[PDB]
Ligand binder design. Structure first.
Ligand SMILES: CCCCCCCCCCCCCCCCCC(=O)OC[C@H](COP(=O)([O-])OCC[N+](C)(C)C)OC(=O)CCCCCCCCCCCCCCCCC
Ligand SMILES: CCCCCCCCCCCCCCCCCC(=O)OC[C@H](COP(=O)([O-])OCC[N+](C)(C)C)OC(=O)CCCCCCCCCCCCCCCCC
Ligand SMILES: *C/C=C(C)/C=C/C=C(C)/C=C/C1=C(C)CCCC1(C)C
Ligand SMILES: *C/C=C(C)/C=C/C=C(C)/C=C/C1=C(C)CCCC1(C)C
Lengths: 265, 265
């Protein structure tokens, strides 16, 4: 009556092949980009173009990726769940929980002024929290429980996406014209990246697919380069454009308040 | 070369004694209080005295406690971690992650007006997120890793407590006189309850103590009755007093803006 574990990273694997090389190279590249962006944002801080949100995101991502590179499978980075015989990437989900709220806070503070926050920002944060928590619970469970939690997380995510779309449209119609193009791209980067995470979940060992750990982590690396680093670069670019507009227009941005939008789409 | 699990709730335990009876009675009582407060807040919603935060907190607490009563040890409510041989109360920590942000959001929105949120509210939310995530990581790990994560969570918690103290002092010096007493009590209920969670952690199977699951859960039940239900009742009471003041004073609360405080203590 023995019990062998058979979790990811316990039995020795012949880590060879082009896919593993690409995997490690992409982790190293993401770490390097994150740390470089961290330094660059630290230098840009004094010009009020890079807020604490992007710096924190880059910092946390750098630690995430260094732990991935050197201790991907040693706990607590890998949570080994016994009865379900599952391997949860707890480092990945912890990084999600840290950053996604900060990404949404930066989105709600795209310009940096005071008094622009609203109750809907807090509701957005709550929905994102629920979505990611239910994703973790689905990852740590099996069977119908996992599917139910995935569905609840999907509902939370639909609400979160609707709120974020409202924020993006408001930013587009309030921010100066010079930023409009940038905003569109950022929105794409927001939706192209985020939407990747739910699908990999279905295709990986978590969920009901059969992706290798390396392929799933490669997809997550790309989705992180998109959702975090590119999104932060766009955020910093937009803030720089806003600073230039402030310099050209006596320091004040155009003032729109107590209006309505979102008609039709 | 066999491996027996020995997690909480696997080997049959003779669930008998006065302590178990008190344990189950307190879980049932907390569930009943939470659901009753949920209904009561739903009725009070239309008078703008009970916000969505307390309703959500009561709702989530009711589900937490029903799952505790009926499936405390079945996963995903109990995460069984293999190499570390630990039993993480994932339902408890999920409920923490859901509610603590909402409690802080309600604290930052004690009055309910628009434009009262600030960047410091978002930083507070980030610090609370980090604190609870590090608490979970410590719970799921062992040895020096757990101690290090506990220390980082403690630092996050000190920052969170400092921010909350600032919020409480601002509420005390901005809200009407009639509410001052209430505010003090709420602060106590906030600090008496929250400070209980770090200590039980040290004394339980999580951490480095030897509390029984039942005693730890009893302590957590009391700390939840204090931090959530009593705190929500005080929040609703304060909002009712504010509504009365608004009725007596043409609907507007006293207006204080762009001032400073926190000198000395
Ligand atoms: C892979 C699929 C996701 C990538 C495409 C996302 C996309 O089109 O978003 C950009 C667009 C940009 O739209 P937007 O609202 O960010 O830009 C506003 C532009 N005006 C005001 C002129 C309309 O966003 C969406 O269409 C988001 C819809 C939800 C997508 C997820 C479901
Ligand atoms: C068990 C220990 C915690 C219980 C006591 C908490 C307490 O005294 O808090 C109420 C008090 C009430 O203070 P307060 O700042 O909420 O009330 C403001 C009242 N004036 C402006 C007149 C000073 O809060 C604290 O002292 C919090 C300090 C941090 C406690 C945790 C360390
Ligand atoms: C930096 C990391 C980010 C932005 C991660 C985002 C992750 C998601 C949006 C995940 C969503 C979901 C799952 C992965 C599974 C359950 C269903 C969702 C939609 C909540
Ligand atoms: C509704 C539940 C609440 C308010 C739970 C609160 C929990 C804490 C404040 C926990 C704090 C910590 C630990 C339990 C362990 C690690 C150190 C702390 C301070 C982050």
């Amino acid at each position: 009556s023995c019990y062998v574990a058979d979790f990811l990273g316990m039995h020795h694997e012949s880590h060879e092949g082009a896919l593993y090389s690409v995997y490690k190279s992409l982790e190293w590249g993401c770490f390097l980009i994150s740390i470089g962006l961290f330094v660059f944002y630290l230098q840009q801080y004094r010009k009020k173009t890079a807020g604490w949100e992007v710096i924190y995101i880059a910092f946390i991502e750098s630690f995430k990726y260094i732990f991935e590179i050197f201790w991907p499978h040693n706990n607590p980075a890998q949570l080994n769940i016994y009865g379900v015989n599952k391997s949860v990437p707890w480092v990945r989900y912890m990084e999600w929980m840290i950053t996604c709220p900060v990404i949404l806070m930066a989105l709600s503070n795209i310009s940096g002024e005071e008094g622009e926050y609203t109750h809907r920002s807090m509701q957005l944060l709550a929905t994102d929290q629920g979505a990611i928590l239910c994703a973790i619970t689905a990852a740590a469970s099996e069977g119908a429980i996992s599917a139910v939690f995935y569905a609840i997380g999907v509902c939370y995510g639909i609400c979160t996406f609707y709120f974020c779309l409202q924020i993006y449209i408001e930013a587009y119609f309030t921010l100066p014209e010079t930023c409009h193009s940038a905003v569109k791209w950022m929105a794409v980067i927001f939706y192209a990246g985020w939407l990747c995470y739910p699908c990999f979940f279905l295709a990986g060992s978590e969920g009901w697919g059969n992706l290798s750990y390396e392929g799933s982590a490669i997809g997550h690396c790309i989705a992180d380069l998109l959702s975090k680093n590119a999104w932060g670069v766009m955020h910093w670019w937009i803030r720089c454009q806003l600073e230039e507009y402030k310099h050209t227009h006596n320091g004040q941005l155009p003032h729109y308040s107590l209006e309505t939008r979102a008609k039709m789409r």
